[PDB]
Design a protein around this ligand. Structure first.
Ligand SMILES: O=C(O)CCCN/C=C1/N=C(c2ccccc2)OC1=O
Lengths: 113, 121
């Protein structure tokens, strides 16, 4: 089981600030076909998860371009350049390269008090 | 256009069983991967089962956790995904979600609203 370590657990932000979430796989995540199936998800309160980025870096259609993903080896980062109220929720990174497929523990992006 | 609607959750005592359903429309079913993911009330999304499209022989892959207790299947005539769950227990109580892949290389590009499963008498 490839472990996905997500950090931080809680990321308090102010609307309009940049924000970075990171992941850390315990082994390579390169599928045998060559692709790295690393995606990012966003679960808003009460809603079902939504696909943000796939294959480490490809922003899914319809997703605000303030979202972007990157990384190499076992380090992956999901960046939000300008946090909007609608971006508040729980983010999950996920690897779908090696079985069993694995999510990170989640990162709660919330309003900073 | 793309629709996924789960159904089959409920309240059940330990050791019992249920069959989840995932009705879909808006796309040619047989050509996409389908999956079941659950989220216990605290907690983190957890991948459970997955089944590929026709071009991949409808191959499946299970999470050890539900191995030999859960079984996924798909009715291609009706475009419906199912999940037979046996010998249920506390750690199985959660919201279950069905999801379909993306042709450009993504799992769970679309999710159903999910149904609830509560175990514990
Ligand atoms: O996008 C096209 O219209 C569709 C035809 C076939 N696309 C199949 C799909 N390919 C995959 C998929 C999912 C995870 C890793 C790599 C590929 O999931 C799908 O459902």
């Amino acid at each position: 089981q490839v472990l996905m370590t997500q950090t931080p657990l809680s990321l308090p932000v102010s609307l309009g600030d940049q924000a970075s979430i990171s992941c850390r796989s315990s082994q390579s995540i390169v599928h045998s076909n060559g692709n790295t199936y690393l995606e990012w998800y966003l679960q808003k309160p009460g809603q079902s998860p939504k696909l943000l980025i796939y294959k480490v870096s490809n922003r899914f259609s319809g997703v605000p371009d303030r979202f972007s993903g990157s990384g190499s080896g076992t380090d992956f980062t999901l960046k939000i350049s300008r946090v909007e109220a609608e971006d508040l929720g729980v983010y999950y990174c996920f690897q779908g390269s090696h079985v069993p497929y694995t999510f990170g523990g989640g990162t709660k992006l919330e309003i900073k008090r | 256009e793309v629709k996924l609607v789960e159904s089959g959750g409920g309240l059940v005592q330990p050791g019992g069983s249920l069959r989840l359903s995932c009705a879909t429309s808006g796309f040619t079913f047989t050509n996409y991967y389908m999956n079941w993911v659950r989220q216990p009330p605290g907690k983190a999304l957890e991948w459970l089962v997955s089944i590929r499209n026709k071009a991949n022989g409808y191959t499946t892959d299970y999470s050890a956790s539900v191995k030999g207790r859960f079984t996924i299947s798909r009715d291609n005539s009706q475009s419906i995904l199912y999940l037979e769950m046996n010998n249920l227990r506390a750690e199985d109580s959660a919201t279950y979600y069905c999801a379909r892949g993306y042709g450009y290389g993504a799992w769970f590009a679309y999710w159903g609203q999910g149904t609830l499963v509560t175990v514990s008498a």
